[PDB]
Design a protein around this ligand. Structure first.
Ligand SMILES: [Mg+2]
Ligand SMILES: [Mg+2]
Ligand SMILES: [Mg+2]
Ligand SMILES: [Mg+2]
Ligand SMILES: [Mg+2]
Ligand SMILES: [Mg+2]
Ligand SMILES: [Mg+2]
Ligand SMILES: [Mg+2]
Ligand SMILES: [Mg+2]
Ligand SMILES: [Mg+2]
Ligand SMILES: [Mg+2]
Ligand SMILES: [Mg+2]
Ligand SMILES: [Mg+2]
Ligand SMILES: [Mg+2]
Ligand SMILES: [Mg+2]
Ligand SMILES: [Mg+2]
Ligand SMILES: [Mg+2]
Ligand SMILES: [Zn+2]
Lengths: 217, 129, 25, 87, 32, 208, 60, 96, 124, 97
RNA sequence: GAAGAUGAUCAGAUACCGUCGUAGUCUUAACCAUAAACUAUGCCGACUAGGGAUCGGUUGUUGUUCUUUGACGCAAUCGGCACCUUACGAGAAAUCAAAGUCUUUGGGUUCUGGGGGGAGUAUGGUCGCAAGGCUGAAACUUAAAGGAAUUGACGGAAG
């Protein structure tokens, strides 16, 4: 009980100065307090995608630890992914959720073909790589759901994507690399310059600049 | 040896744009190179470019504006029928709403969207987006 | 066994095979 | 990006690098936002009134940010005869 | 066991004991 | 543009050459090439101090844009520059970082001296490498005093000067403090003589 | 592989398994009725043990 | 340039080289050599009839230890001799 | 050896950062003070803490100690290092009244609109 | 895997280097690969440099040095501690000690 | 110095070590055509990044020594043998200025591989005086074999 922010960003979120995560993203501000994500995205649902047991050989024998993989998202364009190791699974899952929240990125939903209704798919073909695993996301028409393996399908669902084709290459059974590659891929949508984004936008002042006194100390 | 001067031109453009440079030197020039750049310039993917006469094949200096994701050639210049253009645009372009496949048709060099408008087809030459 | 000596064993045994077939030439 | 009815269905129109025009991603933490004060005719800094430039972490990573600011500021009049177009 | 298997189920099984002991000590005493 | 009162005056130019500011390292990297005027026959490279002055004026204008003066961090790991940054912080209200920079001061939020500066200013990219690296993790712009061998990676504003001079370091810091205060209006105009002497900001040996 | 061996022990376990007759249990419903039975058992009267849901819980 | 010809008139080289290289697929080799037809005891058939020659029994591999109870069968269609396992607890007593 | 441990080294230096005005250079006086300042479980640790605290106090009077930061050593130091000579050693009065820059640097000076007297020096 | 980028020798832009015999074990070793030490040692041990000068019939006669170039193969040199096993990162250091 | 013989060592030692020693080693005419024949990395062309050295050539220029020209020094450049830093970029990693410009997938072109064994075996052909070279299967068997790196353990390796 009782959260005391330790960062400038946390203080600005503790006061009603910053009310959405898109203000965080506009200035690429680093997030270090999970309470920021809880306040701005109150309705988050998590899912423990995989649990693995890793062992470290010692002089007498193995010292076993538990590795947890957690996927977080709001099903409306924001998604995160966390992997953390601890002695116990319950503490590992709880801590993996925290760092999954800290890494939450926005995604661009777009239209396959006509722009009728709300965006339902990706705006362009994207690809991500981690290890040997390469995950490719292709925009899909409104009928096909998530054409992906159950591991990749869950990441897409929590991000709010309705319509997408998928193709993966490499050792997809390495679950951590597959999710990390897809997380990088889904985040590249806000890295791909499209002609509708060609317009130059003015650089607004950072929220850390306009509210300097509330973040002082 | 030098088997495709358009590939050399686009390779120089790709390497300069990815490294953030706003200008690139291309050698040698050609009519196809100039017309490929003109199509790119018409859609805003490059800026002004300059042809330098050296009493030889020539050189070109192109101004880059950072909007270019990728331009490339298709070697060889495959023959493309009109019913095959849909398959080519699906494979090469990032989406159905932007990007262009450049063709050389007997009606001239043009993007696949202009090619659909004038109902012509030729050999595939490259792409840009 | 060593790859070099395995080859020598087979070369000497191929040598034997060649000599054995020549009987019925 | 906007839908058929014209509503801006896009959330978070991102910033772009002033030097290379690349999109500055939401987690590009090597990217910075330079704020430069305006100066009145008395030699005094004008309060809360700035020229702003943004650089992606890529430009800063190549070590070209310094020469890019020399060019970018000189075109905006913030500098004189420090950056040369022709080398 | 390979997996953490029931790891916490053992703890959630552990927890009715504290609520049962606070409640057990809260009764007799009330009527002691 | 800029009023002519902001031009390099002859007085400041005398200070810069007497403090050996114009002496740049023998070997120059490609990114510092615009700042070299000509190479001196011994091997030293002559710094175009006209460019040095404008970067100083440009740097002071960026410093003046930070709202909280304590949010500006001035750093120096070289012993020749340690005295300069402590006095600069006192005069301007900035936060000085002299000597060792504790790794994790910008990224680890449970450390003792955990800061969130809006701007980091560096005396030398070579000897202050640790401070510059962490700034590229938390979106901190970097202003650096650069010699001809100083790296320019993750350096936005480079001040061409002599980083390896006992007198060179103090003068550039003294000049910034005077100009930063001039913009704030503390100094009435660009002609009033400052009470502080450039001798202050200079390193003193334990002898004295 | 050396292959041989006495064949006298063929069928040992199945022969010595004690025969148990099936209790004459009520027939289970067939066709559309059986799909109806499974649906209620899994989504109408949920028997979950506070997030622990088992189709065939052994008595424990 | 990826080490293979790309020219528009090099289709024969691509077709022949691929034809040469599918021989590295053993599944493909067995289909064209007709190895099931020539070497397989069934001759490519799914099933085959035979006459029981003897009840014998095969010792299992490590780390397992058991007597796998099989029979020796001579196929009617071609006279070839194979060993066939007799599944389930005690079905060897059904085979004479 | 007589190497003090960490439970006594860090606990003693917390006292200096917290109770420097009340401390002193005498162990006997220091020994009595820590019995009312800290809760020490054993007598032997109380003398050990005071014996190293006294040593640190004896070391602070000889100069600044590492690891102890309080509130009067540094406040006195900011204006302690104010020494400045009457002549600037950078003022052009040590020389004849003009710069001694090398002739190559003088060309840069000539390029700018400045007329400053110079005695060119050619080290070569 | 590949342990050293130089393959333990000094052969680049060359096909073959003629061998030399190790001083210690007489193993044939290529000249670029051999561990080479230049030694300039005094011909007389420091204990005997005084009495030999007094017994000398020449006033102020300088004792000659003993010049020798030693060639070792890899097994002899490692065995004789001429070179030692270094860490993976310390192997790259090739300045003289 | 293969072979062979011999003195030692060892439980045994045909060997390591020691002593003799024939082919061979060298050369002339012919054969052979194989090597971890290695950069385990095809060739041609373009581009992408900095630095200090060096070899060959050319062009501008010295507080240096020398005949009585030549040497050295400083800059540019083309080409090389290499080397150092970084990683825009690649990779499973070790690592790579190419092993980069590869789902944002197409510069030209030659050769090779398709789980591990059986196997470079049998057979046919062909070259060779021979040893052998080149071409080259199948039956059958098998759930792994293998690459890089990590922790530990061990080592008649170093500190
Ligand atoms: Mg841990
Ligand atoms: Mg990108
Ligand atoms: Mg589409
Ligand atoms: Mg289209
Ligand atoms: Mg970084
Ligand atoms: Mg097989
Ligand atoms: Mg102690
Ligand atoms: Mg090895
Ligand atoms: Mg050669
Ligand atoms: Mg060789
Ligand atoms: Mg030597
Ligand atoms: Mg013998
Ligand atoms: Mg021949
Ligand atoms: Mg190869
Ligand atoms: Mg595909
Ligand atoms: Mg065989
Ligand atoms: Mg291995
Ligand atoms: Zn040897």
């Amino acid at each position: 009980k009782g959260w005391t922010p330790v960062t400038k960003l946390g203080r600005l979120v503790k006061a009603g100065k910053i009310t959405s995560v898109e203000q965080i993203y506009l200035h690429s501000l680093p997030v270090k307090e999970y309470q920021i994500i809880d306040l701005l995205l109150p309705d988050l649902k998590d899912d423990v995608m995989k649990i693995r047991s890793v062992q470290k050989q010692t002089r007498a024998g193995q010292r076993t630890r538990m590795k947890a993989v957690v996927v977080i998202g709001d099903s409306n364009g924001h998604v995160g992914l966390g992997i953390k190791t601890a002695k116990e699974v319950a503490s590992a899952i709880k801590a993996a959720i925290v760092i999954a929240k800290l890494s939450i990125i926005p995604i661009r939903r777009g239209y396959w073909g006509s722009n009728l209704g709300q965006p339902h798919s990706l705006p362009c073909k994207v690809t991500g790589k981690c290890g040997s695993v390469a995950v490719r996301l292709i925009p899909a028409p409104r009928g096909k759901g998530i054409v992906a393996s159950p591991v990749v399908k869950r990441l897409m669902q929590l991000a709010g994507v309705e319509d997408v084709y998928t193709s993966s290459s490499g050792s997809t059974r390495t679950t951590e690399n597959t999710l990390k590659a897809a997380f990088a891929a889904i985040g590249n949508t806000y890295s791909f310059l499209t002609p509708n984004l060609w317009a130059e936008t003015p650089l607004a002042a950072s929220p850390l600049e306009v509210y300097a006194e509330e973040a002082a100390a | 040896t030098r088997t495709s001067v358009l590939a050399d031109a686009l390779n120089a453009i790709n390497n300069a744009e990815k490294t953030g440079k706003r200008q690139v030197l291309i050698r040698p020039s050609s009519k196809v190179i100039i017309k490929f750049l003109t199509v790119m310039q018409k859609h805003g993917y490059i800026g002004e470019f300059e042809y330098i006469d050296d009493h030889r094949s020539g050189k070109i200096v192109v101004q880059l504006n950072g909007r270019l994701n990728k331009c490339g050639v298709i070697q060889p210049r495959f023959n493309v029928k009109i019913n095959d253009i849909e398959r080519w645009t699906d494979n090469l372009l990032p989406a159905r709403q932007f990007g262009y496949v450049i063709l050389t048709t007997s009606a001239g060099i043009m993007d696949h969207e202009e090619a659909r408008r004038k109902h012509v087809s030729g050999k595939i030459l490259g792409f840009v987006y | 066994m060593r790859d070099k000596w395995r080859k020598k064993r087979v070369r000497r045994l191929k040598r034997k095979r060649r000599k054995v077939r020549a009987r019925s030439k | 990006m906007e839908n058929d009815k014209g509503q801006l269905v896009e959330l978070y129109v991102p910033r772009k690098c002033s030097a290379t025009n690349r999109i500055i991603k939401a987690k590009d933490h090597a990217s910075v936002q330079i704020s430069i004060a305006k100066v009145d005719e008395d030699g005094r800094a004008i309060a809360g009134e700035n020229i702003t430039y943004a650089l992606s972490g890529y430009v800063r990573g190549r070590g070209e940010a310094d020469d890019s600011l020399n060019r970018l500021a000189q075109q905006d009049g913030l500098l004189k005869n420090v950056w040369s177009y022709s080398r | 066991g390979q997996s953490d298997k029931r790891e916490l189920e053992g703890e959630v099984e552990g927890t009715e004991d504290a609520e049962a002991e606070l409640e057990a000590e809260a009764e007799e005493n009330d009527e002691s | 543009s800029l009023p002519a009162s902001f031009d390099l005056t002859p007085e400041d130019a005398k200070l810069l050459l007497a403090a050996n500011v114009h002496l740049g390292a023998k070997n120059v990297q490609v990114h510092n090439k615009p700042y070299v005027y000509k190479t001196r026959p011994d091997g030293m490279n002559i710094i175009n101090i006209g460019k040095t002055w404008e970067k100083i004026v440009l740097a002071a204008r960026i410093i003046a844009a930070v709202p909280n003066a304590s949010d500006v961090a001035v750093c120096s790991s070289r012993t020749f520059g340690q005295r300069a940054v402590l006095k600069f912080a006192a005069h301007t209200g900035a936060t000085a970082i002299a000597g060792r920079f504790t790794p994790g001061n910008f990224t680890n939020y449970i450390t003792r001296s955990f800061k969130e500066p809006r701007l980091v200013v560096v005396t030398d990219p070579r000897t202050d490498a640790q401070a510059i690296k962490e700034s590229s993790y938390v979106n901190i712009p970097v202003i650096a005093l650069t010699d001809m061998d100083s790296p320019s990676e993750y350096v936005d504003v480079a001040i061409p000067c002599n980083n390896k001079g006992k007198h060179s370091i103090g003068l550039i810091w003294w000049l910034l403090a005077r100009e930063v205060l001039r913009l704030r209006g503390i100094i009435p105009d660009r002609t009033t003589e400052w009470s502080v002497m450039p001798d202050l900001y200079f390193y003193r040996d334990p002898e004295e | 592989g050396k292959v041989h061996g006495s064949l006298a022990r063929a069928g040992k376990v199945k022969s010595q398994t004690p025969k148990v007759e099936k209790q004459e249990k009520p027939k289970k419903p067939q066709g559309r009725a059986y799909m109806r039975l499974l649906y209620t058992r899994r989504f109408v009267n949920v028997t979950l043990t506070n997030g622990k849901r088992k189709m065939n819980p052994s008595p424990a | 340039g990826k080490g293979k010809p790309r020219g528009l008139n090099s289709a024969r080289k691509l077709r022949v080289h691929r034809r040469n290289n599918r021989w590295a697929d053993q599944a493909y080799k067995a289909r064209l050599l007709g190895t099931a037809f020539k070497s397989s005891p069934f001759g490519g058939s799914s099933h085959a009839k035979g006459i029981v020659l003897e009840k014998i029994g095969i010792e299992s591999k490590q780390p397992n230890s058991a007597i796998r109870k099989c029979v020796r069968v001579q196929l009617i269609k071609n006279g070839k001799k194979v060993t066939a396992f007799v599944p389930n607890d005690g079905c060897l007593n059904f085979v004479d | 050896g007589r190497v003090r441990t960490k439970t006594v080294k860090r606990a003693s230096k917390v006292l200096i950062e917290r109770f420097y005005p009340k401390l002193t250079l005498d162990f006997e006086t220091n020994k009595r003070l820590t019995s009312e300042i800290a809760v020490i479980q054993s007598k032997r640790l109380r003398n050990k803490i005071a014996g190293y605290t006294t040593h640190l106090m004896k070391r602070i009077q000889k100069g600044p100690v590492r690891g102890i930061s309080f509130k009067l050593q540094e406040e006195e130091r900011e204006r302690k290092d104010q020494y400045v000579p009457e002549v600037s050693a950078l003022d052009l009065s040590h020389t004849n009244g003009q710069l001694e820059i090398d002739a190559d640097t003088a060309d840069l000076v000539k390029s700018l609109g400045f007329k400053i007297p110079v005695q060119t020096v050619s080290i070569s | 895997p590949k342990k050293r980028a130089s393959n333990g020798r000094n052969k680049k832009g060359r096909g073959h280097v003629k061998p030399v015999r190790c001083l210690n074990c007489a193993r044939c070793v290529p000249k670029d690969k051999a561990i080479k030490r230049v030694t300039i040692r005094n011909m007389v041990e420091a204990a005997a440099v005084r009495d030999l000068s007094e017994a000398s019939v020449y006033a102020e006669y300088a004792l000659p040095k003993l010049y020798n170039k030693l060639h070792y193969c890899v097994s002899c040199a490692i065995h004789a501690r001429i070179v030692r096993v270094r860490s993976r990162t310390d192997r790259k250091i090739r300045t003289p000690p």
